Design a protein around this ligand. Structure first.
Ligand code: PLP
Ligand code: PLP
Ligand code: MG
Ligand code: MG
Lengths: 413, 413
């Protein structure tokens, strides 16, 4: 990787550590490229023009395929009109109508940039609404990288999160107890719609857990907040708890509802409308029309096409394939969570040395898979993509067995 | 008009209060349109296709003109390659090199979405760097709408800002005293490069204030942070304190350095590089290429063209024109701050009833000016635009004189 190497030398001079945040390759095998040149459909190309079938989907945003022609057409049409203007475009009204119409629990929407903006807004809203302090979150749940919730706490004060308290995800007793430990002071419960965290097996939400969240919120006046930034529109065409029959008061959305254009949302029921008006949240870029035009067209496609069934079928095929290959090579997998947003670990691999080696070996076959973070399917992944993926993964299992003696854990990890 | 009324009716249903944040027309005279259709150069068109010469410049981002063709071509070129991908584009390196090369105090850059992202990152970085808690800000200075700094505190806890302390802007003794009041506990000083706040006259930064900030930071090891999100690239082609001979440790940038594309930055010296690596900040959209391509082209135009001299000359002409005009009509204006980012109030107008009537009367003449928030000039405003503007302001001054006895203050204000 001549170009990659040049880019990494230069990057370290002018970017702290060469790169930062969730897309940094600091904790990945060294074979993983940091910098890319182009993307299309379900593929990315690194700086040295090596293609990869992309199972990160840009860490969520690529729902329908990179440079999907209908969304790029809608964005083009709005770009001729205006983007970041002295006021929002009229199409802000159309977007809020569309999004509110699709989400059964919601009567209103607010638009922002980052998913962290929507979760932070939900936190402040809930405190305004209830006049209480305590925000309940699941231990280890990722809701953004603000001082109140960032998972690494360099430069974070105890005071930044003194009124955040924790429960065990999928543990109805734990959540009940959390309500009583801060009796009378719960502003909100935040829940992701399933367990989707790094270095950990995924798990679907348990019905009893979700019901208890809704019932405790009901009995106390606390707001139920579903954080759908990650799973939104890959579980359902509505809030990801729709199939449990549990409606939140607020839901947070982002990543993929404009297929890569930067826009996030807070959706809320009429119960929370007054508090939403009382709080002050804004940003320079929150009223920009082009991301809103992309979102309108993405949401239309979500409503009008079998995008969801398509990307689930691709996910299921990959999962079945990997199960068969794992048995054949005698290397047991743990494929957890929904097949369309899979976590694919090795059984009995506590320092991840097997998973790391397998993921790196998949790069050589032109497949990008991730050894510690959940993956994603797009509606642009084809049957041929899955077939070619499985040829790469087959070779990767062989390469891991061939080298098995010499496998090492990642130093930094 | 008719379209505007329909949109406001529809907006109220699906958006809390029908709109929110800085771009809400809540506190403006009712003639101000909320929703727009298009923008080009120095003009915006509301939903009823009425054009205005725009002196808000989208509340800062429109530095070079809406849909500036060279920036749009650079954005097009990148859009054919890739935008939001599994990793950043190689052009992130080019951007960082360019921005670092232009900013004398800076050795590295980090990119995010919101200006609030950059200011929050600088806060967390300073705490990590120093191991101290206290952040010093000027009373009433706007640094974003995060829980630690948001100007309206519905849903905000005392604990959200218990380690933020305040000084009086442009009062060196006040700042020096705030250092001593938290002796050995100052992580950072934040300062905007001039006073630019709503409902208040603007004021340029005093040299002795800026030197005291630098010297107290030098003596204590606190980081000096200049918040250049609003003023950046309308004062200078570097950090807005360049002409005072004062270099900060960190500077925050946003709004206009990609001419409307959503991107913000934190620029830092090597002193702060280790802390920058230690903290965890990220966002789904922070590594998107197309705003970075727009930023590279905007920065080139900033370096290679007389854009700054152009918008300063336009601002200077408008200011001299309005001074002469107001005097002829027997009304005194208070035109404060740089001519290129002016606050234009009336003398002896404590409840803004005069300023509000005047601003409203300007709208009728195809001029968008703001009675409580600073305005902005773009390099796309021409001498003829200013000439046409002064014809409309003439009729506005006459309308104010005519209706003078019947002026009433804004209800909600
Ligand atoms: C569940 C969840 N919440 C919040 C966020 C924050 O979104 P962003 O990175 O756009 O701030 C992410 C990513 C996420 O996966
Ligand atoms: C607008 C502004 C910010 C915040 O930027 P957003 O993009 O709105 O989050 C920060 N500092 C100053 C001086 C500003 O004017
Ligand atoms: Mg609804
Ligand atoms: Mg420099």
């Amino acid at each position: 990787g001549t170009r990659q190497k040049d880019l990494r030398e230069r990057a370290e001079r002018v970017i702290p550590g060469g790169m930062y945040g969730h897309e940094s390759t600091r904790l990945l095998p060294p074979e993983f490229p940091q910098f890319f040149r182009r993307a299309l459909g379900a593929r990315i190309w690194d700086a040295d023009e090596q293609p990869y079938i992309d199972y990160m989907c840009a860490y969520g945003p690529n729902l329908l395929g990179y440079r999907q022609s209908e969304i790029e057409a809608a964005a083009d049409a709005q770009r001729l009109l205006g983007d970041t203007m002295t006021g929002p475009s009229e199409i802000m009204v159309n977007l809020a109508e569309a999004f509110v119409g699709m989400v059964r629990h919601a009567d209103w929407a607010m638009f922002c940039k980052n998913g962290s903006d929507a979760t932070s807004t939900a936190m402040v809203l809930a405190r305004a609404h209830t006049g209480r302090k305590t925000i309940l979150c699941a231990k280890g749940a990722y809701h953004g990288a603000s001082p109140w919730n960032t998972p690494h706490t360099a430069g974070i004060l105890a005071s930044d999160r003194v009124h955040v308290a924790y429960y065990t995800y999928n543990d109805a007793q734990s959540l009940s107890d959390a309500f009583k430990a801060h009796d009378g002071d719960i502003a909100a419960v935040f829940a992701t719609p399933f367990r989707h965290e790094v270095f950990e097996d995924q798990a679907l939400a348990q019905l009893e857990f979700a019901r208890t969240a809704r019932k405790c919120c009901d009995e106390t006046g606390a707001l139920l907040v579903v954080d759908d930034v990650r799973a939104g529109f890959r579980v359902a065409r509505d809030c990801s708890w729709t199939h449990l029959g549990i409606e939140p008061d607020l839901s947070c959305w982002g990543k993929c509802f404009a297929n890569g254009y930067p826009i996030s949302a807070l959706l809320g029921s009429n119960k929370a409308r007054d508090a939403a008006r009382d709080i002050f949240v804004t940003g320079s870029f929150w009223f920009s029309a082009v991301p809103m035009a992309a979102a309108i067209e993405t949401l239309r496609i979500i409503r009008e096409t079998p995008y969801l069934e398509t990307l689930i079928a691709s996910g299921a095929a990959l999962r079945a394939g990997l199960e068969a290959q794992s048995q054949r090579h005698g290397l047991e997998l743990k494929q957890t969570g929904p097949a369309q947003m899979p976590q694919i670990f090795f059984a009995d691999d506590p320092d991840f040395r097997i998973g790391y080696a397998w993921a790196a070996a998949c790069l050589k076959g032109g497949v990008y898979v991730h050894p510690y973070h959940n993956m994603f399917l797009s509606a642009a992944h084809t049957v041929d993509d899955v077939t070619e993926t499985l040829e790469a993964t087959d070779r990767a299992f062989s390469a891991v067995l061939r080298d098995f003696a010499s496998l090492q854990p990642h130093p930094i990890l």
